[PDB]
């Protein structure tokens, strides 16, 4: 029914100040400077990317809509690209981890208070 795949530790660079959006939300751009993915289902080095969450208040409560784009190489050398939008993660990689493309991958990300490190635990749902 559900299988643990990997965790990720993501190093975040200097974020840009919030961008005011029409309607009252804000977009916060957080460059990714590196990080590591480790687990039974995926092992890789994060080389770059960005998070671009949107913060929007609806009915008095701020919801954060995550958007994340990251890339690197897997432990076998294969380039990968991950897009995040619980949240769904779409993993595009060939080589030994290629079967991740066939999986419905969900992630639970958290960011430390100072917003220098994001961590996420990811698992596949056998729908």
Ligand X SMILES: C/C=C(C)/C=C/C=C(\C)c1cc(O)cc(=O)o1
Contacting residues toward ligand X, per CB under 6 A: 8, 10, 30, 32, 46, 51, 53, 66, 68, 70, 82, 84, 89, 107, 109, 111, 118, 120
18 or 22, CB closer to ligand X?
Answer: 18
24 or 38, CB closer to ligand X?
Answer: 38
Min dist CB 86 to ligand X, Å, is: 10
The C-alpha angle 93, 119, 45, rounded to 5 degrees, equals: 35
- DSSP annotation of 99: G
71 or 77, CB closer to ligand X?
Answer: 71
Q: Rounded to a whole number, what is the distance in angstroms from the first to the last CA of the chain?
A: 7
The answer to whether 85 touches 64, Cβ cutoff 8 Å, is no
């Amino acid at each position: 029914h559900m299988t643990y795949l990997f965790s990720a530790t993501v190093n975040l660079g200097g974020a840009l100040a919030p961008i005011p959006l029409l309607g009252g939300g804000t977009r916060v751009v957080e460059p990714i400077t590196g990080g590591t993915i480790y687990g039974p289902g995926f092992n890789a080095t994060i080389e770059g990317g960005l998070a671009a969450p949107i913060l929007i208040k609806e009915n008095g409560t701020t919801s954060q809509l995550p958007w994340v784009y990251a890339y690197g190489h897997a432990s076998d050398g294969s380039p990968f690209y991950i897009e995040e939008d619980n949240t769904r993660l779409i993993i595009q990689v060939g080589g030994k981890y290629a079967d991740l493309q066939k999986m419905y991958v969900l992630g639970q990300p958290s960011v430390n208070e100072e917003r220098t490190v994001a961590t996420v635990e990811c698992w596949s749902h056998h729908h």
